[PDB]
Structures are given as structure tokens and as C-alpha cells.
Symmetry: C3
Subunit: 209 residues, 3 copies
């Protein structure tokens, strides 16, 4: 039913202990990045949040305008974690696995379960999400995802309900899911997530008034 | 069967009476644009034509290289209508609804109904379709859509049969539907639509000679 | 089962004996290109290889960062062959047909047949594949395609096993299939294809260790 969690899955995982030199150049890896962790999953934004969380928990970095939406996805969502040795890379992958299976999650917008949404607060951003313009390393953030009409209406509602700012905005392309990042205090990001959720549920209930 | 109409549907609709100031800046709305109409449908090009028609019927504007094809689409096709007040915005949405449900339409190219096409004359363009290079505000236009091989062959056939010009051309990306806009007198655009249709039916009948 | 061939199909074909002048300008055709061959198929990379092969077998040319993957595809994969007359164009299309139906092929990575891959050596490149940076006209080449995690791991394995170089690399976008082109001697490209295949089979067997 409405507000029940969707739980994604990890589809494949491998570690490259020592990247080939020619491949390292083509990937433009920094000299300190020797090893590479590869993980694929069937959800877009939950994987992205898990990746950012890994950057705080291990000595790894990820090697905005991407695909967004819940599981199952059309294909593989791949993240490449780069690190100084295979142990740090494995620590990063373990953090990602843990957060994909028991971290942020999409929810159903209605009882029919034809529409989903994500409304999640990242209390402290790592190096991946803070790469976006307007998001500072360590600051909190509201991560909002919905179908484009619901997203637009919800974003407007969130900005009106809470003391938050739109970090950056790129409008929807035909797409199935669009995302938005809001910035402000931790409590204000929570209020924005609650207001975003109410707007999405309202439209999912009665899409044509 | 062949030439029967496909009828799309409106999936969701909302009006924002007064857009949040921060959101207005991110959407780069002109100062006279105070209100916002949101409508989503399951067809690409029929919705786009309906949007252009709304710009003539109300004081609204839409806030080429997009998705093209018939219903049902993979996700939501969203249009945002911007206007000076909620009454004009509602007038625009009412015009769109009317033209989505009884205006331009895709048709089946064969009796098996595995392939569709659009061949429609816009007798007087509004401000949305005339934003394309080579299309002048108020002038007529042939709006042609088909699968990429059929589209290419049909466009060549249309240009040969009627006194029309290719307004602008971007080749197909793997895609399922590509579009073309032709320019000329109202009668010449009609002849181009008839010739485009004949070529599509011919290929849909006997794709490999 | 694993390593069994996937066989694609030709979906539609037409020849334009004499391209309309306005259409020729929009397609930016050279003055010697008078005729146009249109062919659509349900596989991405097998069609691309067939197109390159046609450039050696006929007086035609094709009018990297495209769609990749096996059949069936979401829509039509179109190739336009441009040539000096309809006879040369027909010779090009006949070469493409022959190579789509009995040339390069994707294979299943596992017995469940949920994942496919392509590992093929082009012994002598024509004018189409050699348009890529780092590929010289007439030189051999390894053409590698797999799902993004398998592709990444396989490319690293290929570079380590054989005396080959990565011609050019663009990382995966959410995607279902990514491609890589390797350069070197004919025998070294074969060894790279064998090593790429072993890595893909290994992951397809045991994706999570
Ligand atoms: Cl990072
Ligand atoms: Cl407009
Ligand atoms: Cl070529």
C-alpha cells in the first residue's frame, strides 16, 4: 500500500586490486587511486546515496544529470569506487551494501503501487553529493525524487513549507522520474521532506481534480 | 486496422496559483509569469501540438530535440504553462485537454498495429512551435512523425510531392520515433502529409522488398 | 545455454535512387553522394560492424557514443548508406544483410540467458569504425560489448592478458550495455577477446562472491 518501502537489490560486485596502467589513464585516475571497487544495483538514487555514504566510511571516492528512479531499473546502475588499496575499497563496498539494503528507500505513493517517490534527508553529505553546485561538504540536505509533475508541485510545496533553498535545478527532459536537492538546516530539510511527501500523496490520490 | 486513430489520455493536472520566489528564479520565469499550469499525458507529439494551440487560446507560454512517439509512453510527458494569473493558466490547460482528446492524433500504419505515425497540418502556429528555427509565428506547417526508416523515406517523398521546405532537420539518434517539420502554404503542407502517409503505409505493408 | 549465438533480424529496407535536393542539403551529403540506402535492424553493434564491412565491399559510406546492445532492441537501429548510384548502394545493403545474418554475433553469458556479450575481432577496419579516434583505416581491432560492470572488469582483464591498447574510452552513462574498442596486432586482439570473454562468463556465473 501507500508509504510502504521498496527494497532494492545488489546485482553484481567485483574488486580490481591493481588497475591496468592504460586503463588508469583512460579513467583519469589520480596517482593515489590504485584499486577499484565495482558494484551494480537495480535502483538509481538509493545507490547514489549509498555511494556518498561510503566516502565518509572509507578512503574512497566515486570515479545530478544522471538516471533517477526506483527498482527495478532498465539496466545496471554501476558505481566505481577508487581507493589507495583493496582493503579501503572493500570497506567502501561493505558500506554501500549496508546502505542499499537498510538505508534510504523509495516508497509507494498510492495503494495501487503504480507510482513511487523518495523523500530523504542526508544529515551530513560526503564528497560525492557535495560535488553538486550549492552543496557544501558536511552540510545537511533534502534528497527528493518523484515523477516530473509530482516532483515540480512537491518542490514548490517544500520551498513554501520550510526554511530551505534549492541547491541547483535542471528541469525534466519525456522522463519517468526527476530529482531535486534542497539545502538548509537538518530540521528544515526534514520539514521539506514531509511537505514534499504530502504533495505527492495528494496527486497520487487525485491526479485530475 | 491501418489508419485507425490512437487516442491518448491525460494522466495528471495541477495549478500553482503563486510560484515560490526561489523556484521562480531557478525556472528563470519572466516577471509577468506569476502562475504555473502543470499537465502530464501519455503521448509525446500530440501533447506538444496541444501546448502550442494553448498559446493562441490563452495568455500562456510554455516554460525539437525532445522525445517523440505515440501512447503509451515510458513515463510522463510534462508541459508547464506559465501565465499572468490562475484564470489564464486554467484557460490554457482547458485548451490543451480539448486538443489532446479531440485534436491531432497518431494513426496505425498497418492492420497488425505494431507501427504508428503522425501526419498533421498546423494551419496557424503559435509561440511554441514557431520557436523552432525556420518556423515563423502564424505560418502553417506539416508535423510528421514515424519510425526512423519510415520517417526518412517519407520526408524525401513529401519534399518531392509538394511545394514544401524542411524547416530544420536533426537526424535520428537507436530510436523508435523521429520527427520532421515542413514549411510552405497550407495546401502544400496537406499534400506533403498525404505523400508522407503513402510512403509509411507502403513500408508498413512490405518492409523488405 | 552459455556461449550460444544470438541471431538478429533485418526489420526494413529501402533505396532512394535520387535524394531530394533540399533533403540532401539538410543531410549535408557530399556532391558525389547521389543515392541513399536505408536499412533497419533489431541489434545495435552487429549492425554497426556490418555497416563498416559494407564500406570495403561497395562504394558507400555511412551518412562510438551511440546505443549498444543485443537484439531485440527498444526501437529501430537505422543505418543510411550513401553512394554514387543505386547499384553501389544495393551492393552495400547486400553486404550488410549477409553480415547481419552470418557475421559477428552476441552470445549468452550464462545458461539462464539474462545477460549477453560481444567479443569480436575486426581483422581489417573500413571507413566507419576507423572514424573513431585511435583507429587507423585498415588496422585490426577488438570490438567488446557487455553490461557496464562486466565490461569494465573485462576491459581491465583484456589489457592485462594481451599486447593491446584502448583506442578510446568513454565511461558508462544507468545503461544496459557499454562498448570498448581495443587496438593492436590481429593475434593480440584475439587474445584480448578470449580474456574479455572469460571475465564476463566468470561474473555471469558468480556475480556476488
Ligand atoms: Cl567522491
Ligand atoms: Cl511558448
Ligand atoms: Cl563511412
Amino acid at each position: 500500500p501507500a508509504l510502504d518501502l521498496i527494497r532494492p537489490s545488489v546485482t553484481a560486485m567485483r574488486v580490481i586490486a591493481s588497475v591496468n596502467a592504460d586503463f588508469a589513464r583512460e579513467l583519469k585516475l589520480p596517482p593515489h587511486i590504485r584499486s577499484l571497487g565495482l558494484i551494480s544495483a537495480d535502483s538509481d538514487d538509493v545507490t547514489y546515496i549509498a555511494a556518498d555514504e561510503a566516502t565518509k566510511q572509507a578512503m574512497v571516492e566515486v570515479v545530478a544529470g544522471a538516471a533517477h528512479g526506483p527498482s527495478p531499473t532498465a539496466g545496471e546502475v554501476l558505481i566505481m569506487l577508487g581507493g589507495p588499496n583493496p582493503a579501503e575499497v572493500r570497506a567502501g563496498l561493505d558500506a554501500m551494501i549496508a546502505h542499499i539494503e537498510n538505508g534510504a528507500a523509495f516508497q509507494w505513493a498510492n495503494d495501487a503501487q503504480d507510482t513511487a517517490f523518495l523523500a530523504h534527508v542526508v544529515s551530513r553529505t560526503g564528497s560525492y553529493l557535495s560535488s553538486t553546485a550549492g552543496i557544501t561538504l558536511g552540510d545537511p540536505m533534502a534528497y527528493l525524487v518523484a515523477p516530473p509533475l509530482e516532483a515540480t508541485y512537491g518542490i514548490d510545496a517544500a520551498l513554501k513549507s520550510a526554511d530551505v533553498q534549492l541547491a541547483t535545478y535542471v528541469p525534466p527532459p519525456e522522463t519517468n522520474y526527476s530529482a531535486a536537492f534542497l539545502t538548509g538546516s537538518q530540521a528544515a530539510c526534514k520539514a521539506a521532506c514531509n511537505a514534499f511527501t504530502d504533495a505527492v500523496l495528494e496527486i497520487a490520490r487525485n491526479p485530475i481534480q
